[PDB]
Write a protein that binds this ligand. Structure first.
Ligand SMILES: Nc1nc2c(ncn2[C@@H]2O[C@H](COP(=O)(O)OP(=O)(O)OP(=O)(O)O)[C@@H](O)[C@H]2O)c(=O)[nH]1
Ligand SMILES: Nc1nc2c(ncn2[C@@H]2O[C@H](COP(=O)(O)OP(=O)(O)OP(=O)(O)O)[C@@H](O)[C@H]2O)c(=O)[nH]1
Ligand SMILES: Nc1nc2c(ncn2[C@@H]2O[C@H](COP(=O)(O)OP(=O)(O)O)[C@@H](O)[C@H]2O)c(=O)[nH]1
Ligand SMILES: [Mg+2]
Ligand SMILES: [Mg+2]
Lengths: 101, 427, 107, 430, 429
């Protein structure tokens, strides 16, 4: 209702919504959900300090996850390795041949 | 508590700044009614840099809307975020400049200069400490070019200590809305060198180029350029409005950029510009911002920075960023291509960081660059001016309003003077 | 040649020549030579014997700074060739220092 | 008693000291509100009943860094008018910080120093925290140190000045400001402890295994240097050292008072289970050139004098065993005229860990503060940097117009040039 | 981190890449929409949260194959800006792909290469895909590899170029383009893995029993060769063979970088049940000339270098039993100055099977890439085609009018003639 008569007839095209050229998709890597934007540098509080330095927590957790996954893969490979290296002359081979003969 | 007074001039100045006040009010949480609805107390810590408190919790901008025709004053008022502005600051004419630099400067604009100098003086005395004055206008018009630059001349005699941010757009060759456009540009730049403390140069042909190859917009409307310029102005004052690990005021960026008083023309590029198709596929990191920021296609001036060496540079970072990762990227871009950086100014780049990013962005940056490559744009204006002036084309509109041809030659004699002092630092 | 081979043996440096192009690459031998001709200005204690590129650049930067201070000249191109290990740069620097320190003639 | 008044100048002074006063409250158990739930007397003043106020001032021309302390967690800790704010920043301008806008705010600065120095019975020293690259740290820090020399004669002052780095710097007019501030801290500062940001970046990269350090990570372990050096005044130990004895043992000549700093155990939480911290282990680690907080290599120069600040479970028996192993090391040498260089101090309290910090629980620590002739090359890095800057007169119109005359640039130049001749002559063999 | 960049040039490059990127997304569990429901870092650069984009560029002057990817089943996987299309194709003309309509698209090609190069921390090499018989693959492939050498020095480039067949070709001016494109890849490519469509036709007829094959069948088992070549970087194994390992063991001279290709177990599920795939049985199939991916006879030449990429349940002992029996067999022949010419690489992951591929589930696989002097017999046939072709000077006005000078046909002729001369004398005893 606060429009001059010459601008009210073409108000739609004139102003519109030009925020999309800098706003991003909410389900994207660039989006911040209005909670981490207004962080304060936390001196006395350790959790506030971690929240302010969350990228250090991020890459520390990335390295921890990578080493945990490598540990899981190497334990599985070691189990398969032990099962495959357990085979020898004392294993259950040639016994059926001996029984048939 | 470092206040900035904003002045908008003409069709280009009002439309740019109306979009500018939409962004900064959204960042500070002011609704179109005028109250406050933000979620954090950080928006009220430095609300006074752009907003004067009023009765009832309303916050009014420190904006002086100024024009020689009343049509564009109603354009800002009728749109959204238009009721925040004080109606007392709406200074307007009745006739219109008519794309005439003399009408803005000498004949018709002089009746409004005493009117607009009163509201400038009223707004400067109201606030405590002036950080500087922000002006946004055009150079190809008649209101923002002619009447705008005499306001720059008048405001510097009254306040010779405070800063001057001129977000003046320069006429382009490829997009040419006006045929006397090189005439008004050369006269305005002559009045801009000797008055303004620092100038940021924008071109519409570069803003079109950004909107086509970066943003991938099929039909870039005329307000999509102004939102790019809105992100420019919101980035310069980010350290004033918000806390930071390393602050940078307008005076701090001025001393770090210009080595000499006349080298005060920069070019700005807002860094995290992504197309909607590519938004999910680009990861924002500190190194990923640096490659887009230094890209030649991202800068909002028509001058290619690869032609001339960067004299100095300025980086304005916003978000949760590591200062080692921030400033080691500045030594990577200084070591990888040292041929584009000048040698007698070692460590050309000034870097500063803020911990409050803009709304909806995890990380953002803004670049201010003083380079000797910016002379290429003044050459094209000087080439067009020298082409028309020797034939005395279109001069009877100019000489009929009291502007003699002597100051037309003086304006060109300052045009190649700025080009020459740019050129001797390219060697 | 034989004159500079006799000359480097008379200095009695700790490092053995063998393949001198690889030996003087780290800068330890030329640093020892400069320390012998100027004991007060340059000592061996300001030099680390290592094959690392950063330590090599540090040692050759020390040598360049102190020889520029003292007036002794060796080519920066020869320094770059020595730190990059190109053939003949070490030999050419050896005869250049042989002429520069105490004046004799090259055949 | 014994007290220190820690003044923090410039933004870097506030942020370093903001991490410092976090560390001092955890050292003495003081809560952030200031209520304790006798060693606190040096840094904190007992006021009324159950309230401790720090003996510090936070002065900066820019209001936006000083109100962050006002709004933040430590709001109740400080006296509200003890944090001096300014109307506008110096904006990296030495002339603004020294002449134009630094003259108005320094009158209030000396007033609270008089109020703080009257409160303490026996004043021991002044801690000056600033960065000479900025306008406030160099400009206002120059005139404040000058006015402290005339207001308090002979009283000791300690300068922890963050210094511009060779490779990395955050500004362009920094070599102009640092050269001008070099003259100011040459005569006024009694012991100037150099600090460099790239070296402290390098420490956190390898020792604290953080590939993206920030200013918050630097100032936490810069605070560990200040706490360890000043721990002898607070807590009892086998060999206590005061500020007055610290100067006479480390400053051989009145114009050679520049120091290098190193903190030996910089160990993350994961590494600390495997790392061994013997007394000889940390003394070897302290003298490693990679462990320094100044981008400077001691191999180029000679160690003129050294100090070792041992914290935690360190007996006086094995500190001398580590001294003998350092003195017999070939890579580390002393000057010929100083046979006894080490001046060791031992304290009985282990360093504490801040919540959310990166340093681990460590029994014993070493804070090595030593005078060296290798310091002459960091002054020569910006002797050549500023000379080509001044060669054809850039950024001088900013400094000429704000009160300073042109000739004061020359006066700060042979001050640095005659400083360079002094280190090479003193470290020369005799 | 071990991390590679793949470049696909031309119609053959895009369609091979479609089958290749189908297999890498299946190996790491990457769904086509881009979400995993740690080894992917060599091929997929993770972007923030829940998205993995390929480190590839699909550049072609032909627009119809680029937007087929944009509208296919993999629209959500690839970055839209990395997908580079042009207005008009080079149209079988080496002059057009190099000089006239190659310059205006190579500047955008390097710009996307710059953004991919500085994003990846440790770049291992470029896996370039092109076809020397076409206009874009030969022409733009020449111009791109000119710029990659100048911009990125001493950095490895692996080339899988589809080379024309003596019997069959889908074009007439292929002898012109392939001769001109060989000089470009001779001085600039570090690894050249030849591929011939007729040989992969003959592989499909007898191995998979698919006697009417298409290009989709060809690109799927080409993709098994490329994936097993780079499978050492991705997954852990007994013998890791990095990208830089391949050059130092397979090229003995800088101008000799042409290698045959073979993939030994290529069977269907109706064939896999009866066949007992042993390591010795598989390795004998790799050295068979029937399984070679270039229409060539290895018996005419001599094996100068070799490389074996073992995948799956391969004990490191039985590979040496296969190497020993191969060296004793006299139908192969190694050159007298290379007594140890084998490079064995063992990976602990069985190869994935694409839903719908002709290949079946195999517990073991071998990717064979061996340098031989028989490649001199490959270029000799196409040299005879071009010598007959150029003698009466036909199909030349197309090349002359589009920028190229007449003497560049002549200069590219002794380049292949010198390549013939070198391959004869190096293998000579
Ligand atoms: N160690 C450390 N150094 C800092 C920090 N913040 C800034 N610095 C240093 O300060 C320099 C920037 O100039 P400053 O001294 O901060 O300038 P200022 O204190 O803001 O004073 P003004 O010039 O008035 O703005 C940089 O070179 C940094 O090395 C910090 O948080 N920690
Ligand atoms: N293996 C394989 N080869 C192909 C495929 N498509 C085309 N080719 C080969 O490519 C050669 C012709 O060049 P193309 O790649 O089709 O076309 P181009 O190189 O892009 O040249 P222009 O079409 O003019 O742009 C033919 O001889 C085919 O052998 C394919 O899908 N798979
Ligand atoms: N980027 C941008 N440019 C504008 C806008 N409005 C006008 N211009 C430019 O300004 C020039 C003409 O300005 P003009 O209307 O004569 O300004 P006035 O005389 O002060 O009213 C044209 O070349 C336009 O490109 C705007 O909203 N955004
Ligand atoms: Mg400041
Ligand atoms: Mg094609």
């Amino acid at each position: 209702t606060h429009a001059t008569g010459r601008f009210s007839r073409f108000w739609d095209r004139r102003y519109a919504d030009t925020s999309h050229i800098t706003s991003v998709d909410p389900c994207s890597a660039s989006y911040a959900p209005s909670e981490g934007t207004y962080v304060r540098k936390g001196w006395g509080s350790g959790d506030a300090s971690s929240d302010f330095l969350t990228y250090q927590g991020a890459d520390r957790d990335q390295r921890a996850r990578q080493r945990q996954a490598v540990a899981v893969r190497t334990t599985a490979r070691s189990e398969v390795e032990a099962k495959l290296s357990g085979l020898d002359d004392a294993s259950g081979l040639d016994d059926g041949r001996l029984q048939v003969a | 508590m470092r206040e900035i007074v904003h002045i908008q001039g003409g069709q280009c100045g009002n439309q740019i700044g109306a979009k500018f006040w939409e962004v900064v009010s959204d960042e500070h949480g002011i609704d179109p009614t005028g109250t406050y609805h933000g979620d954090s107390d950080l928006q009220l810590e430095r609300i006074n840099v752009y907003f004067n408190e009023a009765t009832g919790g309303r916050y009014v901008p420190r904006a002086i809307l100024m024009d020689l025709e009343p049509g564009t004053m109603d354009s800002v008022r009728s749109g959204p975020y238009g009721q925040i502005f004080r109606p007392d600051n709406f200074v307007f004419g009745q006739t219109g400049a008519g794309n005439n630099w003399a009408k803005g400067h000498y004949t018709e604009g002089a009746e409004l200069i005493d009117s607009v100098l009163d509201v400038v003086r009223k707004e400067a005395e109201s606030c405590d400490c002036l950080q500087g004055f922000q002006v946004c206008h055009s150079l190809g018009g008649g209101t923002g070019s002619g009447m705008g630059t005499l306001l720059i001349s008048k405001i510097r005699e009254e306040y010779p200590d405070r800063m001057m941010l001129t977000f003046s757009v320069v006429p382009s060759p490829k997009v040419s809305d006006t045929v006397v456009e090189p005439y008004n540009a050369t006269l305005s730049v002559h009045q801009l060198v000797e008055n303004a403390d620092e100038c940021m140069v924008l071109d519409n042909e570069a803003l079109y180029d950004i909107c086509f190859r970066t943003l991938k917009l099929t039909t870039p409307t005329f307000g999509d350029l102004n939102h790019l310029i809105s992100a420019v102005m919101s980035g310069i004052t980010c350290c004033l409005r918000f806390p930071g690990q390393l602050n940078a005021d307008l005076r701090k960026l001025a001393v770090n950029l210009i080595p000499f008083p006349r080298l005060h023309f920069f070019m700005v590029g807002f860094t995290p510009l992504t197309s909607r198709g590519s938004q999910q596929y680009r990861a924002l990191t500190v190194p990923e911002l640096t490659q887009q920021m230094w890209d030649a296609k991202n800068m909002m001036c028509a001058a290619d920075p690869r032609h001339g060496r960067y004299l100095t540079a300025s980086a304005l970072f916003r978000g949760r960023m590591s200062t080692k990762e921030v400033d080691e990227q500045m030594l990577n871009v200084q070591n990888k291509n040292s041929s584009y950086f000048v040698e007698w100014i070692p460590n050309n780049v000034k870097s500063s960081v803020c911990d409050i990013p803009p709304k909806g962005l995890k990380m953002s940056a803004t670049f201010i660059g003083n380079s000797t490559a910016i002379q290429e744009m003044f050459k094209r204006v000087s080439e067009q001016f020298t082409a028309m002036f020797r034939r005395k084309a279109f001069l009877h509109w100019y000489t009929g309003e009291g502007m003699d041809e002597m100051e037309f030659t003086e304006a060109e004699s300052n045009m190649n003077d700025l080009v020459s002092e740019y050129q001797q630092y390219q060697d | 040649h034989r004159d500079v081979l006799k000359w480097v043996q008379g200095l009695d440096l700790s490092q053995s020549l063998k393949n001198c192009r690889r030996d003087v690459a780290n800068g330890f031998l030329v640093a020892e030579i400069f320390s012998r001709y100027f004991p007060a200005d340059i000592q061996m204690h300001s030099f680390a014997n290592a094959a690392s590129s950063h330590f090599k650049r540090d040692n050759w930067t020390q040598l360049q700074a102190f020889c520029g201070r003292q007036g002794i000249n060796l080519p920066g191109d020869l320094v770059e060739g020595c730190v990059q290990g190109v053939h003949g740069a070490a030999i050419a620097l050896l005869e250049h220092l042989y002429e520069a320190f105490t004046g004799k003639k090259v055949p | 008693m014994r007290e220190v008044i820690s003044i923090h100048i410039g933004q870097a002074g506030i942020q370093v000291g903001n991490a410092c006063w976090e560390l001092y409250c955890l050292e003495h158990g003081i809560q952030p509100d200031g209520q304790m739930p006798d060693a606190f007397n040096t840094f904190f003043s007992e006021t009324g009943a159950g309230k401790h106020v720090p003996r510090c001032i936070f002065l900066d021309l820019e209001p936006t860094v000083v109100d962050e302390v006002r709004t933040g967690t430590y709001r109740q800790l400080f006296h509200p008018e003890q944090l001096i704010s300014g109307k506008e920043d110096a904006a990296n301008n030495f002339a603004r910080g020294h002449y134009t806008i630094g003259k108005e705010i320094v009158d209030l600065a000396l007033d609270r120093i008089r109020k703080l120095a009257d409160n303490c019975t026996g004043l021991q020293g002044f801690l000056v925290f600033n960065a000479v690259g900025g306008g406030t740290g160099s400009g206002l820090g120059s005139l404040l140190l000058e006015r402290l020399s005339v207001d308090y004669g002979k009283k000791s002052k300690l300068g922890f000045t963050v210094y511009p780095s060779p490779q990395v710097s955050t500004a362009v007019v920094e070599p102009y400001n640092s050269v001008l501030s070099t003259h100011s801290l040459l005569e006024h500062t009694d012991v100037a402890v150099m600090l460099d940001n790239e070296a402290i970046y390098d420490i956190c990269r390898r020792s604290l295994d953080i590939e993206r350090p920030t200013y918050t990570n630097l100032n936490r372990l810069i605070a560990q240097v200040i706490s360890s050096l000043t721990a002898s005044l607070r807590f009892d130990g086998a060999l206590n050292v005061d500020i007055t004895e610290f100067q006479t043992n480390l400053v051989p000549y009145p114009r050679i008072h520049f120091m290098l700093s190193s903190y030996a155990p910089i160990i993350s939480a994961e590494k600390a289970y495997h790392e061994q911290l013997s007394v000889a282990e940390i003394t070897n680690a302290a003298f490693e050139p990679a462990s320094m907080m100044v981008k400077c290599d001691p191999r180029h120069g000679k160690y003129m004098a050294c100090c070792l600040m041992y914290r935690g479970d360190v007996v006086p028996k094995d500190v001398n065993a580590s001294v003998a192993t350092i003195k017999t090391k070939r890579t580390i040498q002393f000057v010929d005229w100083c046979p006894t260089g080490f001046k060791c101090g031992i304290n009985y309290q282990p360093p504490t860990v801040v919540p959310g910090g990166d340093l681990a629980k460590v029994q014993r620590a070493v804070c090595m503060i030593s005078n060296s002739t290798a310091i002459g090359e960091i002054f020569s890095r910006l002797d050549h940097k500023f000379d080509l800057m001044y060669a054809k007169r850039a950024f001088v119109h900013w400094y000429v117009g704000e009160g300073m005359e042109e000739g004061e640039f020359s006066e700060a130049r042979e001050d640095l040039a005659a400083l360079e001749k002094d280190f090479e002559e003193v470290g020369a063999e005799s």
